[PDB]
């Protein structure tokens, strides 16, 4: 299995560049490429990705051509350039999975048994990461249900190395927020977290509506994960917790009051100094 996938910034700019160049000349939905990376103990670290020619027919959903010789030659070239990178999976810019993704995953497994599909969306979404690493799982499902190839999910996160970090910092030095918890950025982040929570809850509610109406199947799994979530609710308004939280709020407010007093005294001292300076300047004027 793969416990997590780290997609370095270059993979993303390579996948944005491939989508742009293919889209600019002709029009093609989705963009398929091979992901190259190194294996940690269990955390796959994707660093580079190269394009692979890929024609598909959306209508049939079973016709798709992916170069074998082209992929092998590209991998040989990259091994000559840097051999520490072995094939670890494939990426396609298509926002949603596709019915033929399983065959492509098997073809990739032909080159790497532990293949991770990272769906690198090229549409900027303000709520969430741009990667979603998927893996192929064949099981018996235990709970007496038909088994199929499917796509198990693995946590994805975007890291970077020193060189990529330096490049990113140079690139985003004009649209980057200051590092440090300025109150403006803290309040904005809290608002962003509220918005993200609202979006996640809306997605969960839409899925629950679909399940209730029958449009989608009752999982019998993960659903009780939502039940566990609903059990883990804080249960505020308990008397003991209310007293403790009031104690904490007052303990913080006393420090805030001391800070406000210090700020007021400093401001008053500065005002006194400025007034005396102005008066002295006026007196020395004549």
């Amino acid at each position: 299995a793969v416990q997590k996938v780290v997609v370095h910034p270059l993979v993303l700019l390579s996948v944005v560049d491939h989508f742009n160049r293919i889209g600019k000349v002709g029009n093609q939905k989705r963009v398929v490429g091979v992901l190259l990376g190194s294996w940690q103990k269990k955390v796959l670290d994707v660093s580079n990705s190269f394009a692979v020619p890929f024609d598909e027919d959306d209508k049939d959903d079973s016709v798709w051509f992916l170069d074998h010789d082209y992929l092998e030659n590209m991998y040989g070239m990259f091994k000559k350039v840097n051999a520490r990178e072995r094939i670890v999976g494939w990426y396609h810019t298509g926002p949603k999975l596709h019915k033929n993704d399983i065959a492509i995953n098997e073809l990739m497994k032909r080159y790497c048994p532990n293949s991770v599909l990272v769906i690198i969306d090229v549409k900027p979404k303000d709520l969430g990461l741009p990667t979603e690493a998927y893996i192929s799982v064949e099981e018996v499902h235990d709970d007496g249900t038909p088994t199929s190839k499917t796509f198990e999910h693995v946590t994805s996160e975007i890291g970077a190395e020193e060189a990529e970090e330096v490049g990113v910092e140079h690139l985003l030095r004009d649209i980057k927020d200051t590092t440090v918890g300025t109150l403006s950025q803290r309040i904005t982040n809290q608002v962003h977290g509220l918005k993200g929570l609202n979006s996640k809850l809306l997605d969960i509610r839409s899925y629950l509506e679909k399940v209730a109406t029958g449009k989608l199947p009752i999982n019998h799994q993960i659903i009780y994960q939502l039940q566990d979530v609903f059990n883990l609710l804080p249960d505020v308004s308990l008397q003991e917790f209310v007293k403790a939280f009031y104690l904490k709020t007052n303990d913080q407010m006393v420090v805030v009051y001391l800070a406000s007093l210090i700020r007021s005294v400093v401001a008053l001292h500065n005002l006194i100094n400025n007034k005396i300076a102005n008066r002295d300047a006026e007196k020395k004027e004549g």
Binding site: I187, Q190, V191, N198, L201, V211, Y224, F230
Partner: protein, 94 residues
């Protein structure tokens, strides 16, 4: 069936539901905690059993509908709080 807020279970209620004597409820709840089916705590002075349940359960379409409307209430509350914070901190938001 508890409203998820009054999670405390009276000893009489458990005795009646499970048809177990007054003194048998202690051992029953202890076994439930031991096997790994409940992660709460038990109190004898008030004869109420604290409930913190981790073991999940299968659902029914009616149960799913109830969960869906409860989550709708939760998301409406979250949206209201987000709107309040955003409107009250427009100047500082940036």
């Amino acid at each position: 069936t508890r409203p998820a807020n009054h999670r405390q279970l009276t000893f009489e209620e458990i005795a009646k539901s499970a048809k177990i004597t007054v003194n048998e409820v202690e051992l029953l709840v202890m076994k439930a905690l031991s096997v790994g089916l409940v992660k709460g705590s038990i109190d004898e002075v008030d004869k109420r059993v604290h409930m913190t349940w981790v073991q999940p359960r299968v659902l029914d379409l009616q149960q799913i509908k109830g969960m869906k409307d409860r989550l709708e209430f939760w998301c409406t509350d979250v949206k209201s709080m987000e709107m309040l914070v955003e409107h009250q901190a427009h100047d500082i938001l940036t």
